[PDB]
Amino acid sequence: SMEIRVRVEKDPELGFSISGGVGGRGNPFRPDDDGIFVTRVQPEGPASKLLQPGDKIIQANGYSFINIEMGQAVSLLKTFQNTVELIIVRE
């Protein structure tokens, strides 16, 4: 795996969906991982060609997503304006 930095600019949203979280309902890639996983990406949205299903988000605008709950991850990402700098784990 690898740590990739991507910048997704809200227009007006980031354009992707996430699954997982600590105590959450899991993810379709690695069930033994309570991390946050990109699950669906809008074909021509702000995250298109930048994020892919399976991406594990471990940092968003300097905020670590390790041991984060889903409700908190969604809350944080909706709070950010403009661009969100992500650090993702990609195969």
């Binding site: 949203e13 980031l14 992707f16 969906s17 996430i18 699954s19 309902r25 899991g26 699950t39 669906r40 889903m70 969604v74 990402l77 909706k78």
Partner: peptide, 5 residues
Amino acid sequence: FDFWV
């Protein structure tokens, strides 16, 4: 069960 951001 995914959430759109």
